[PDB]
Structures are given as C-alpha cells and as structure tokens.
Amino acid sequence: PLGSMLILTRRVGETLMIGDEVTVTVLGVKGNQVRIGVNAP
Amino acid sequence: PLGSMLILTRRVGETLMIGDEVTVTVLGVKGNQVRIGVNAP
Amino acid sequence: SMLILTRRVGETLMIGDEVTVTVLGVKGNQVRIGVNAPKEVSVHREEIYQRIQAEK
Amino acid sequence: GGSMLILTRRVGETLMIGDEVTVTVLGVKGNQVRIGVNAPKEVSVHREEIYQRIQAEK
Amino acid sequence: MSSRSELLLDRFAEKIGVGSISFNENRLCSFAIDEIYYISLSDANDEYMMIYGVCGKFPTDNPNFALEILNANLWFAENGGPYLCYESGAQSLLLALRFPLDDATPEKLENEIEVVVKSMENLYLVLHNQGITLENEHMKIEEISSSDNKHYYAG
Amino acid sequence: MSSRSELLLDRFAEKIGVGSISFNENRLCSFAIDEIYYISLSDANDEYMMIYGVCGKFPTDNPNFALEILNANLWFAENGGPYLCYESGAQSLLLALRFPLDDATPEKLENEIEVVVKSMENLYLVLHNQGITLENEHMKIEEISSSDNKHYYA
C-alpha cells in the first residue's frame, strides 16, 4: 500500500544515493527515531 | 554433432516411452553390448 | 508382444517407420540412448510419466 | 562532520530534499531503518556501496 | 498440525505477530512482512519449504525484460539464491528460495525471508533505475499454476 | 603455484580423461562431457566456482519461451537444481550452478557437473515434447557479458 514509493533498508552507517548530488546516511537510531545526515546543494 | 537426436540415460531396468504405446527397456548390459525390450503396438 | 533384441554401442534399432533408437555409449550399467522421432511423438522417462499421472 | 545537514525524524515522518524528492522513515527495527523514497523516474537511487562497486568495475 | 512444517509456521506467525496463519488447500499461506513485502510460504514437501517473494505483475509489453530477468538469474546463482521465476497463474514475477526443514528455527526462517526481502528491494531498485515500476496486482499466492514438466525440472 | 581451483581443475581433467583444460583471460574454460554436453567453468571467486551447462541458442522469435523458462525456474528452485539463465553475450540458454571450493574434491565436482548434465537431459526432453530443438552455436563460453545490475542481484 505504498504506491510508487521505492523502499530500501539502511543500517546505521549505511548511505543512500539519490541522483548524482544527494546522499542520505543513517547516523543513529533510538526507539522509533533516526538521526539522518543529508548532503545536497 | 548429433543433430536433433534426443539423448537420454537409462540404467539396467529403466524404461523409455515413445509415443503412447511404445516402450523400450534396458534388460541387461555388459561390455559394449546391451539387451533391449521393445513393447510393440 | 515384447520384442527382445541385442545391440552394440553405435548400433541402431527401428521402431515403426519414423523412430530410430541409437545406443550411444555404456558406462557401468548406464546406457546413453539416442532417439530420433517426430515432434508430435513424445519421449518420456517412464517413472517420471507414472509419477505425473499418479497425481490424478 | 561528514554530512552537511544533520536532523532527526521519527517513524512515519518525512524529509524533503528539494521539492521533487521525499524521504520517509517507514520503520525501525534494531539498527536498520526502512526508508521510502519518492523521486522522479529519471532520478536514480542507489545503495552507495553497490554503486561504489559498479565503479570498481572500471 | 501434522508436520514440523506446520509447527514452524505457527511459531513463525507468533514471532512476527501476523496473527493466525495457516497453509490453505494447496498448502500456500500468504502474509506481509512489515506490511510492505508480500511473501508466500508453501509446504512443498516433508523435507523443504518454499519461500516466494511476490515482486509484482510481469510486464506485458517488453519481451527484452524477460531476457533481462533471465540474465539476472546468472548472478543470483552466484550468490546462492533466490531464483527469479514467473508464475503463470497470476502472471507475476517472484523470487523463490527453498528452506531446509532440518534444524529449522523461526529465526533461521526469518533470516532467509529477509534475504528474499533484500533481493526484492534490490530488484525494485534496479527496475526503478531502468525506468520500470511493477504493478502491484495479485500479490497473495493462494495457488500455483502447476506444470506437468515439474518432475523433469531437476538434476 | 596454481589457485586451488586450477589445481582442482587439472586433477579433475586427469580423472575424467580430457587432455589439458585451463582457464582463459576471462577466467573461463570449456570442455565436453562424454563429447555431448558443453560445460563451462568460471574461476570467478576464490570461494566458489561456477558450472554452466550451455543448452543452446535462445529462441530469437519466441516470447512465450522465455516466460516458460522463467516458470520452470520455480520447480528447479524446489529441487535445488541449477538456475535457468540467459547469457546475453552469446544469446545462449544456460544452466548455472554454484560449486563451493571448501572440501572440494574431483569426485564432488564430477557429481555436481553430472547434476548439470542430468538437468540438461531433462530440459532437452521437455523441449522436444513441446516441439522445440535449440540451435547449437557458441557452445563454448569464451566470455560473459557484464552488467551494472549484477552487484544488486544478491
């Protein structure tokens, strides 16, 4: 029930690439909260 | 090298079906000689 | 009517007019067998065909 | 200081990069996070380590 | 229950919390992991269980797509499963992977299903980068279209 | 010396009766089982070896054929057999099987290649019963066509 959403799992310390200019990194996890690092122009 | 020839392996006592009413059985083997049992229509 | 015959490696037997069976080789008690037959004529390992039909 | 922007999001919350990309925190279990990405069809999405090895095939 | 496969399914439905799961008439039970990934389990035989990850409806236009899927089976073979397959009944692309019933625990079953899930994700990813998204139709496998040739498909 | 796959291959060659089989630039070799079945071996990784049973040229005209081959991968998965694959470089239909190098023995390598050969036999039978005979061209895998997506297929 997520439509065209692309879904992937990332462990703490694993990085996600979007396009050529954007990256999303899982920095930490506690409970249902996540610390995210984002690189983009 | 053998064209459209279908190649099967049959041990002593195993049977091969051809069509609906033809069967071929390997009845014995020694050396380069084999005995064959063909059930006729 | 079961016809019993003997062939050597490299030899051949005819079944009907359109099917020829070739003794290709022998390894232990295993015989490599060649079959020339039309498309509409099906070839089956008998024990496999029986398992197919045993499931109704 | 490896990432330029650091932020926190809870499960079911959303982070937008630009106005055509949306990142959704779908679920958390242990130290692995389910992440959702809505992006244009021409925007490619990669696991960074698999992309690095695609570059390793020089 | 009448087999170690049924006891495995019950303990697994308990560990995941998907409620009451039971093999159906064809011994095929479908559920959702994290309410995201559609996975069906088949009590294939007294020795193995089959894990199916239903990716989506198979494209109807692209013939080259089937060749890409087939080519992908080369690399899935290098990395020990799962198998990219087509299911004729639901016309769906799916990832199949067998699970040995010897020394089988719900933790192992869950880890194997996670390997299916990881592969589903990777496939979704490469299809998106190719510009393809699979329609999400007929996800629950209640019956598998059987082929008389199934008994020949072995080594 | 040799890698433990090259040493295993020389030992398997002497045990079977083929003169001298060696991997090439692309870490591939090809040989004939009983002069009937084309088997290719890949020395890709140091933990596993790949056995490829080249069945024949993929039917260029048949769209239902690819779907039937995919549908047969279901039952090949149940039986733990090799994978039905398509080699895009030579456009061949392949049966692919991973062979682990730990505790590898020429007896086990022969028995796993026999599994591939048996699967080829049964596929040739099934194809014949559907009125299909695959062309016989490019049976020696000189080189596998690479793809960027191969690292994700895991």
Residue numbers in the entry:
A (entry chain E), B (entry chain G): -3 to 37
C (entry chain H): 0 to 55
D (entry chain F): -2 to 55
E (entry chain C): 1 to 155
F (entry chain A): 1 to 154
Paper text:
secreted protein Tir (translocated intimin receptor). A central player in this system is the CsrA/RsmA protein which is able to bind the ribosome-binding site (RBS) of target messenger RNAs (mRNAs) and thereby repress translation initiation. With an extensively overlapped site involved in binding to both CesT and RNA, we further show that CesT modulates the CsrA activity via competitively antagonizing its binding to mRNAs.
Inspired by the high homogeneity of the CesT/Re-CsrA complex, we used this protein species for crystal screening and managed to collect a dataset of 2.3-Å resolution. The final model contains, in the crystallographic asymmetric unit, two CesT/Re-CsrA complexes which are essentially of the same structure. As expected, each complex is composed of two Re-CsrA molecules and one CesT dimer. In the complex structure of Re-CsrA bound to CesT, however, the chaperone molecule adopted a quite different dimeric fold (denoted dimer form B hereafter). The N-terminal α1-loop–β1 module, instead of being swapped into the other protomer, remains unswapped and pairs with strand β2 of its own molecule. A most important stabilizing contact was contributed by the α4 helix, which protrudes into the otherwise exposed groove formed by helices α2 and α3 in the other protomer and presents several residues (especially Y153) for mainly apolar inter-molecule interactions. Overall, Re-CsrA utilizes its intact CsrA-dimer part composed of helix α1, strands β1′, β4, β5, and their intervening loops for CesT engagement, contacting mainly the β1–β2 interloop, the long α3 helix, and the swapped terminal helix α4 (from the other protomer) in the chaperone dimer. These include the Re-CsrA residues R31 located in strand β4, K38 in the β4–β5 inter-loop, and V42 (with its main-chain groups) and R44 in strand β5 interacting with the CesT amino acids D34 in the β1–β2 intervening loop, Y37 in the β2 strand, and E121, N122, N129, T133 in the α3 helix and its following loop. Superimposition of the two structures on the Re-CsrA/RsmE proteins revealed an extensively overlapped region between the RNA binding site in RsmE and the CesT binding site in CsrA.
